[PDB]
Structures are given as C-alpha cells and as structure tokens.
Amino acid sequence: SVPRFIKYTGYGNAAGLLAARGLMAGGR
Amino acid sequence: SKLKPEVVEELTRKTYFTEKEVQQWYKGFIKDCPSGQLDAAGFQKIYKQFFPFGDPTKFATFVFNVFDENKDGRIEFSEFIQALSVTSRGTLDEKLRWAFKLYDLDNDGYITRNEMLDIVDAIYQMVGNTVELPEEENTPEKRVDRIFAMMDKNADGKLTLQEFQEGSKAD
Ligand SMILES: [Ca+2]
Ligand SMILES: [Ca+2]
Ligand SMILES: [Cl-]
Ligand SMILES: [Mg+2]
Ligand code: NA
C-alpha cells in the first residue's frame, strides 16, 4: 500500500494535508 | 490560558471553527507552547516526531514561512488557527489557493517548474518515496515533469492560480 494522499503530491493537496496534521499535533 | 472574549469572537468569525473549538485549540496550543509563540525549531520538531528517519527541514521551513503571516519568526495563535482553518476546513479552491501561496516561493504570482520540484522534493525528503524498479523510479523530477506539463495549458513555463486550481478538477 501507499499513503492515500501522496497521489496528490504536486497538486497542492498533499502539502495542505501535511501542514494541517502538523498544526494539529502542535495543538494536542 | 485565557483568551480575551473579543479575540475569541474575532477569530471565530474569521475561521470555520466554533467559539468552543477556537478556545479548545487555544488551550492545546498554549499547553504545547506556553508563551503563545511557536518558533521554527518547535515546528520542525513536530514533523521530526512524525517522520524520525526522513529529513523534514525543507518542508517545515517552507510551511512555517507561509504560516508566519507577519514574518516575525514566530507563529502566534491568530496565525495558528487561521492556518489550520484553511488547510483543514477550506473548500477545495481555498485549500488550493493556500497551496499556491506555498508553491509560489518567490511570490511572483506564478509557479515555475523549479518551485514545484522544491516542494515535491521537500515532501519526499520528509515522508519518503514509493519503492519501484530502478527502471520506473519514483523521482520528484519525472513526477513534476508530468503534472506541470499537464497543468501548463498554454505551455509558457509558468502556472497561474487558475491553471493550478484546475489540476485535479474534473470537467
Ligand atoms: Ca508571526
Ligand atoms: Ca513563483
Ligand atoms: Cl502537494
Ligand atoms: Mg523569480
Ligand atoms: Na501557463
């Protein structure tokens, strides 16, 4: 298997998801 | 960790979060960053904890600089919650508008192929690449060559926001 959202790498969505997950870790 | 009512209300109006959610995120943010100001080392630490054997330096620096709206070297709570609102709860177009800001590293209003490669390479450096045959290697370069050419409808070597936003959208 491959991470679900890495198909969107280069489209912007992968960076956005990874950015959000980092912020969420910073607030939990 | 007490947020002044007016501030909570304003941040609620400016985001997709309820007032309860804003206050809950503030409580967690202040617990993790007691001063209310997240510096670049702490931001990279988050990502190293996700990917302790990738190299998150490049990705974390690129994203930190976009999140740091007033470019004072710190992510304040107002920057934290507004960044989280767009990247987690935006429409597709709002999320892609945010990503365009990230990819447009020189802030000239276009994404050039070297900028797309910088972000994509940063992503692979942190999270790794898919193992393939040496003859079908998953290199950022060939992936970017494909996507960029697909998006660059007028083949002028640069992507507008319009060209970028249409990249996965079906017609
Ligand atoms: Ca700041
Ligand atoms: Ca640019
Ligand atoms: Cl991406
Ligand atoms: Mg330039
Ligand atoms: Na173009």
- The residues facing B101 across adjacent strands are none
For residues B63 and B44, what is the distance between their CA atoms, to the nearest angstrom?
10
Closest CA to B96 of B42, B16, B167, B19: B167
The answer to whether B116 and B143 are in contact (CB under 8 A) is no
**Specified resolution (Å):** 1.7
Known binding residue B110? Answer is yes
Give residue B76's identity as a one-letter amino acid code: E
Residue of A nearest to B26 (CA): A27
Return the closest-CA partner of residue B126 out of B39, B60, B73. B60
Q: Which tokens sit at B129?
A: 């690449």
**Beta bridge mates, B38:** B75
Q: Do A12 and B95 touch (CB under 8 A)?
A: yes
CA B9, CA B65: separation in Å to the nearest integer? 26
Can you give chain B as a three-state secondary structure string? CCCCHHHHHHHHHHCCCCHHHHHHHHHHHHHHCCCCEECHHHHHHHHHHHCCCCCCHHHHHHHHHHHCCCCCCCEEHHHHHHHHHHHHHCCHHHHHHHHHHHHCCCCCCCECHHHHHHHHHHHHHHHCCCCCCHHHCCCHHHHHHHHHHHHCCCCCCCECHHHHHCCCCCC
Helix axis angle for B92-103 and B113-127, nearest 10°, is: 100
* Distance (Å) from CA B24 to ligand 5 centroid: 43
- The ligand whose atoms approach the alpha carbon of B109 most closely is 2
**Cβ partners under 8 Å of residue B142, min gap 6:** none
End-to-end CA, chain A: 28
The domains of chain B, with CATH numbers, are: 7-91 (1.10.238.10), 92-168 (1.10.238.10)
Cβ of B7 under 8 Å from any chain A Cβ?
A: no
Q: Do residue B143 and residue A10 have CB atoms under 8 angstroms apart? A: yes
| Residues within 8 A of B (CB atoms), A 5-24 only | 6, 8-24
> Do B26 and B77 touch, CB atoms closer than 8 A?
yes
